[model samples]
Target: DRAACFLTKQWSLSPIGSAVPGTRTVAILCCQETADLAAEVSSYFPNHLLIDVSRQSDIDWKEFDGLVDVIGCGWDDEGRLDWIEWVQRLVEFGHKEGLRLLCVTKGLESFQNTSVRMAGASRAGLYRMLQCEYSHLISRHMDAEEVTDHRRLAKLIADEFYSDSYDAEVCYRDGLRYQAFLKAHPETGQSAVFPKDHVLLITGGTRGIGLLCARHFAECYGVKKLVLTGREQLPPREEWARFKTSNTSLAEKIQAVRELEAKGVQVEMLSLTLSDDAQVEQTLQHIKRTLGPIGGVIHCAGLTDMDTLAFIRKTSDDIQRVLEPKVSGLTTLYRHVCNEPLQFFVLFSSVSAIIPELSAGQADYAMANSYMDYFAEAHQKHAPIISVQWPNWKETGMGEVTNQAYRDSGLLSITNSEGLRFLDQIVSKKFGPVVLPAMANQTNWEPELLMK
Candidate 1:
């Protein structure tokens, strides 16, 4: 590798015995599940206002200096759309009124195992983005090990609300408050190499980072077979030459494919619908018959809401727009391939999953990536599964912003070669189940800002 793929950080919560002190005109958002906890928390502040957001169409947020949100405390079903909607409304009102917020959820103590607590995880992602956007105001997310115990939750809430510490993410267990912290990953010498006959499947592989990865694997690892999947259908290979002068995007893709073909790699393109099991299975069968058994999979299909980047400007529909490809798409792909003997299952996530400061306006993107990060951890034992938290690439990919924006944000954008080289290290070194390939030397960066 030409450039060093920076150290991966592990995040954990540490018990902090003392709570910092402060007080505010607090409001409590509650539901049937969190009514007792709300009542207990209200007892801590005699003047606290209690209301259910789902029932109230209009809310006056100006009267409150702080808010306690426990509406999602015990929800354990797929009907979390309403909660997400309410959160969107809250973000809009809270940002407008400049209120400190504390979101409460349960079962984050079991973070190593993810699927069950996804709704809570999404809320955590939203708050992490908020924490970055509103550093001047307090924005915190808390996960309770036992939410039914209203007394303990209220005590933790009171202490957490008053605590002057800037640790924006925390989890409470057994009546103790634990602040989240990050530590450097231990160097593991485990190594991996793709077999020469290996057939690799890449989602979103027609262009951008997926195409970049296809080129890298073929040139570096000597991988002979490649299957690339994209949503859009392109004309047959014979017609590519005709479009070279008229179609810029198609011509670029045609050139890229030609380059791969020149390297003596067998390339197959599929217009596969990742979320549809029926379509994926049909395309996969075609791959097996025409190419070879798929030895590895690199899932890079995703969407970013550039139109509605601000959390306040986003609706539940916008969140779903960004979530489907990473969430249900992964589920369908993994379900089809879980039984096959595979070399690796890689999820191309973003650094925004852990670093709140990086994704100021894209909470849904962060949530989906964050879910994959945890999903990899939960599924690693089944195979060589990993989720890579990649920095924005300077030359290509959806994360491209202005050079000045990157400089102002204190983020070092990865060059195309640098990103591919980092990917090489991730695969060859087998740095799983989650790896963050980002610079760690920013003067403004702090461990307290990390969210798991």
Candidate 2:
């Protein structure tokens, strides 16, 4: 039997220890905004290293046993890439040397409002992945309320630093504690949520799940127009015959396009990178002027690093490339079209973000998907934003490791039709902002299962 899933942040006034025992050499990674708070927090540790992330230098991992991350306590989306790079270094060191990593955010846990920093939300995803991969690097993401008194906040940070009792994701509010928990979402039956008349946009639509969804939407909803975006430059339609023998990927994409057009659906193939703001802005403007207003958006653009190494073996650039599409790319897409009264804004997140244990070595992918999950939460009121925590499809573009891993675990990969059914239901009023769809005989329906 299988059950649909979703995550919720449950809060209780569980007070943590005011003073924790023991001391360790902790390194504080901070920015100019949090310098004072970091300075005060470092005082509690008997031996500590304070590093200003703005002017970062080569780090010696052996110098510290624990890490306190305050560098992610900002609201700027521009700084997220830099945060990814720094976290990659930390993860690299923590993987081999072994470290206790803790991230401190100002107000990311306040998902009810829009005050949460987007950068910190992304960090929350990374820390969650770290928790699954390297728990000893005490993979905890802690959030505290904004206070003018640095010493007061620092004391709480120090307490959490020394304490051993808390979930990987937690928040502190005026001496109270809270943690994010997972809860079951009610299942949905067939419904009409897809906008058949409005033009739809699907990034990474040339391949894999995006392409599949595009074709499915047209077939199921009778959608009139589809704008598909991709980084790969497809040859002209006249040259499709030439590429069929030379390029299989392009051939499949061309086949899908022809299939859509044959069904009387207008398909616009745009060569664009989602992260490039100028390009995104201009391209979107062109779409509005030429095609029509986009009614729905399915953002499935992401990188899995199928050819590169795992998280532990990844370099800074590798991390950047993997995260850029989801982090900066998602943000750019939303920024350009936030004001539009669209039918829906759906993000194709992954199960990796929620069940990191199953994800294993896909830390960057998990972290990136985690950001999508959080972004959906942060902007829930902005539109009908739904982030689907999709399981790897049976024959989709996911890496072989992921496919075999799910199969080995006895979890059934979602078939193409099954995914489209779930997508149709999810976009309807039947589900919340975040939903997980997977088939398994037995599933851990609790977030606390990570304690193992």
Candidate 3:
């Protein structure tokens, strides 16, 4: 449990409200439970528009800008996913239009208790992550410890809607369950973890960010053997003559493969979907029989399904599209081949999971990546699994598509070289249940969204 004084003192130094005053128009998005809360709170703002994100779509975001409600989250609830999606659409529209966004959610974290408490905290946990992407969105939460009344919750809404500092965290009602995100967090790690006899297995190693990690493992760790997987079966047979022009993505992947081989880093190519249990199992057995027990593993395979919040369902095909890769893929590897790991098993999670509000259409992505973190948390004592929640990068992976929007939202994406350095540090020196890279020059809302 965090000390109450710390939560109150830090946020109390000065109030953190939107830099606005007067009858600021409020745009309230609420579920049935929060509708009453929103109605009462709207009294603070002279003018407000109550548009439920779950039902409505085309809101002239110019009208009634501040968004409110927020909630506890449940994975199995279709209605919750719909509500969450609508909230993201409306919130992103507000942020894009430069409107101050305010919210009241469940607390950012829950302690070890019933599974319900853990589920109860999903929104705020993701909300804090969203702070990384959307600076204008500020929030409060009704924590288990923080005793609150309808008036207090309304007051916090008012405070968040009209203040100067952007991060007046929460109402700090008797017990606000605030969390600390440390940079350069010290940890219990093996000094010589990045070993010499390394036969590293990297899922999604052929393209994007995975290539970068594999390169680091080969060059820095002196990994003797490597198994890299991608969806494609083999490298295109195109000669290296017009390689730069015709097949840029595949060319880079092939070039990386060749480069690792040139360095005498015995590399093998395994082309199979990580989500396919049979194929994954087949590949795992093949690797184990031929290559012997693998030394370490990195699960980086994932896909993005921009299924908006208002339209997401628990078992819908669209949700499964994203979950299949991150969640199922991680589990498939865990069950099939992660039995014997000499060094580490790293799951490449995303900030989308950390902050769902930041990327609205990425709930499935967030949910899947979140499981990676929980997997590590639940099983760290028995196995060496570490899930790293990565921020958007400058050009690789999904960053290629969302970098512009991320920057527009007052945030910066990390460059590959910079991320590689950070990755090397953790891989070489840190032992962990989870390692959030302490990448610098993060965002304007660093004070509030303090998750490293």
Candidate 4:
């Protein structure tokens, strides 16, 4: 969680043991340093199991959550991805299945045994991501002063994990606790005016939110020269009638493009994949050659999938499937497309990168979107950039997939019009990472209860 990771005391007896109402089984992942933490917590909760997920592998844990009501994680700094693999696989996955999580890792103090520190931050970042992404199985991060305090550490775990009080991210030092929440910028008061002359580009513009954004840019802002790309191809006019019957997908693509053309927008549908660096580079070179230079680009080219952290592997193709459009694609743009300065470089990111836990299944999706936010932050001087972390949409685009599960998760869907207006605010003003959650918890809980 960007905020920081911390552990505290107070509700020491609240382990997921008999003392808790509907909890029984408890599990903890301990390392050589934090073994004392494992033993102490095990004694507190009778039905306890401790494992040394101390090592990392492409482990698949489909039944871990079914076996325990609460899971705790603490590890050595000898390895990075291994430490994160378990948290991403077990706690994040377990918590989403309705189990509580207690994680005690790097503290405010220095760690002499640091592994890929980047791995730690990814895990920590994901921890913060879950706290705000959804409102379920909330876990608390504990950053301690030292890694070897058995009694206090166990107490910190019990209290932080099972207590009613909630904190997205917290840091503890000198026996003190500090916490912070996700901060959002207010609505943009004005919409960007139509210059009617700038060149606009959109990836994944064939369907869903990309298509939605294309309509808004062409119709609302009256953009004339536009470049739209996606995985699907636009059929020739001679094949239009058959394409409508044989391939409904191509028909949708044709329809979306024709609609933009009807609105006085010169829209070109290019068959492209955002995941390939070379291909993206080639395309960007071509666009600059013909379109003169791009004024704005919306990188909406990534896809999503669900895989358990336990056995998830970052295969070559899998990596490209998620990272191509957001990471490499954007890099290609910065290298080839944005050489002449632009109005906006918008990344259609998601709340998954912000508070992704209930759907622990989306670790890769979260990683991709999180990279988008990081991309914007890292290259502040490159272009006018804004990362929109959208919640579930109400209609059109990704909105068509809305269901009760999403509503039950505390996110109210925003209408297409509302999303477009919000986009207007974002485009008109330059900001860092922003979230557009249609509706969130309206109730206020002391210690700020986790998502009403």
Candidate 5:
């Protein structure tokens, strides 16, 4: 038992070598009879140095740099009661030296008795004594698997003790932070209202922000089913023609969908172009027939124009191409989905709608996004319609364009920190009516009512 206790201490201290190289130090304390046992154990672990208590006069206890790896009384039924006083003294000495005390089988029993005595004393006395037990060495015998039933019993005890330590550490750290936060902000407490399980249809979900949003809803929000709509049905005749090299083919998407489904996330994909109104109608009908009622719609499918002169000319073909996907697509989805009572209808607009001066060559795109915001506000009386006007992002198709434009302008900057903060406010139900996340940016913007 003494040999096992000594070895466990050596093993625990061995990791310190890799953690802190040549600067690491270890000290071992044990009864006179176990001095040889400790030395023998230290030989197996070259990284740790074990100093027996019997040889204390030969070493300077005050000069020790790092922590002391202590070993308690071994499993000796006859010596258990006799060593209680010695165990208490060792713990007291360890506490004085600012060292952690690790207790073994018989040592654990001794420390428990000392804790009871310390508790009965004055708070200050108890505080000092409590440190002894608090820094008590992690039980290592309980981790041994040499013996069949012994290993099982040891693991069970170790697990329980470790679990209690984990809880205590969490309470000391996170609990204290939470308490202070509550005290400083007394009106922050609120009850959570879990949304009912429902379906959320996402357009343009094969890639970019739409795909990411679909994943977040399915994985984080616990949405029952996700309908991912895209324009691509299969791989190109020549693989080299594929625009997105990172899993752009239908086979890749099917595999991804299957993988998500395997993890208990239901996913369905539809092949249809939002630019074509006939395709949108057909897809909507197909979804109604196959997937049942959708509780929400996220209209993220849209187009953008980089030609500023072409946009200002009011060219019928160019304007129609852009509006066909952004304006017509959003309106079509809203009208069809709102046929029943829905929980939320989200329309993705752009910050360009607010600050068109910053986005060159995007007049048509900005106008379409502004129209979407107006459309969402118009349907507020019928259902919970929210238009999220996202600032320049880094991952979406339009975001790439914005990135290059910002780099070229050198003075232009995109803001998203305020947008996220505003989103948090809305999710927490702290804001209402045509909510704009950028409101948290401390910018003065007038609130306008688009419809009564």
Candidate 6:
């Protein structure tokens, strides 16, 4: 039944010598419906041998080894469909025997089936068997665009072949070495001259990307003071218990600060919720009274519901609830900090604001994020505003969910580690005004230049 279902027509095995003349054997796997088709095709190559396989079981995989330089599997039957299973098994076996396997026409269908079934396995096994391993897989039916897409897919798979094991170690070691080198050879470029002993006032700095930015500027950029604000005072014992089990919370911030302070960075912690206008005012007053003038303000405090309309509509105050933290909080921070000698005010936005196609069930969320970008641009004249439109970061609270969805959809071009590396590059560049590494396809931003 397998033999009746599948048939292979051999044309010619052309051996191309790489180093010495006549040293390499290249076998092209051509499919023929009948013996006459095989005979007609074999006449084209005078020196090569033609082997016909009428039955699937008749495939002598052992004979394929180094004898065949290349295997170009072409469709033989004009109207009939080839058995994908038979082709896959043969190709798999051929790979074991070092035979290069290529698909032409209906054979390309077999190749697609093999690739899809294996998930993301390489087709190099087939290439190696036929010795045409060096030659690119050519398809007569596929146009240039289709061929390019296929090649891109193949190349991506090849690049990520061993990513699972090697990625973490490579990034960790490389990051450590690079950071060390950067600190040791401090660039001689004119550093951003903040107001003498300028203090950086940051909200939501106890955790997330904000804490990292705070520490980076404090230690590397030589800021006098790093002020971190949050809603709650240091977490209670029970809160710490929950923090240990869960990933996000205030306790984590305390731990991170302790680690950084142990390294000798001057860090200060403040407890105040940005959503409360009165609290923001009181906190600003306290900072001025206790720590002196605020030179910069980084508003990283914001909230997202991740809830659908159905979920939000369940409460009468749904719309107001979401907007309170995002719009209201940002407005409050801007109003309070505008009067200060703020050299730079950095507002965090999301890429969802640029491409809203990814936004599902949260139209308000997308709009709110877009508002941040427009908000920064609008208030740029008031101060040196730096609106950072960050892409989905895996280290952040929403990163895992966003990354998982992107990964499943085959759209994760950059990993979380890559994002952090890009962040370091941007910080090193320290371009003023708005910085959008993800959108501009560059690590740094200089809004002053654009305005000029």
Q: Quick one: best lDDT, which candidate?
A: 2
TM-scores for candidates 1 onward, in order = 0.82, 0.88, 0.61, 0.63, 0.47, 0.48
**Leading candidate by TM-score:** 2
User: Model 3, range 1-452, lDDT digits (tens) per residue?
Assistant: 11000100122223342546555466666656666666777787778777554454666655545566544421222224455555556555654544554445432232322222233333444444454445555533333322356676677656656665444234343433233333334333134655555568888888778877888878777787889887877644555545656556766766777788898887886787776789888887787787777888888888876545432233456766666666667767788765776587888986555543445545556667766776676566666777887777776776656645454433446778767765665566543556555344433434234422
Clash count, one per candidate = 1, 3, 8, 14, 2, 18
lDDT of 1 by residue, 1-452 (tens): 12243445443556555764434458787777668778888988766778654455365555556777887585633225555654455555654535567888776534432433544555666665676765545687787774347787788778777666566677765555666544345665244667666689899888989998999889877889998888777788878878657658767777777889999998877677787889988887777777777788999999888887777677777787688778778878988877666888889998787777777777789888877776676677776788898878878877566444345544577888778767766777766577877653456554333542
lDDT of 2 by residue, 1-452 (tens): 37544434455444565545554467787877778878888788878888776666477765666678887665534434555555566666643545677888776655433465455766776676575666456677888775526787787777877776546677876567776655454344135455655689999888888988888888877888899998988777778777556556777788788889999998988899888999999999988887788888999888887666466677667878888888889989999988775888889988777665665677778778888887887788777888888877877766334545455545467767777877876776646667776665455433434222
Question: In candidate 2, where is summed lDDT lowest over 10 consecutive residues?
Answer: 443-452
Off by over 4 Å in 3: 1-190, 193-198, 235-248, 306-315, 355-357, 399-405, 408-411, 430-432, 442-445, 449-452
Residue 136, model 6, lDDT: 19
Tens digits of per-residue lDDT for model 6, 1-452: 00000001111112212222122222333334433433443343333344444344455544442221111223222112122233334444443523323222211211122221111011211121121111211111110111323334222222222122111000011112100000111231134565546678877777777776776666666676778876668754345445654455565776676666676656777677676779888888877887778887777776666654322132324544554545667877877878888766777765444332233344345445545654664566677675565656655535556634233322233444555555555444544333444322222332212101
Overall lDDT per candidate, in order of appearance: 0.71, 0.72, 0.58, 0.56, 0.43, 0.43
Task: Write down the worst ten-residue block by lDDT for model 1.
Answer: 1-10
Give the lDDT of residue 240 in candidate 2: 79
Query: lDDT for model 1, on a 0 to 1 scale?
Result: 0.71
Candidate 3: residue 272 Cα off by (Å) = 2.2
Q: Which residue segments of model 4 deviate by more than 4 Å?
A: 1-125, 129-168, 171-177, 183-195, 235-247, 306-320, 400-405, 430-432, 440-452
TM-score of structure candidate 3:
0.61
Query: What's the CA RMSD for each of the models?
Result: 4.1, 3.3, 8.5, 9.1, 29.5, 22.4
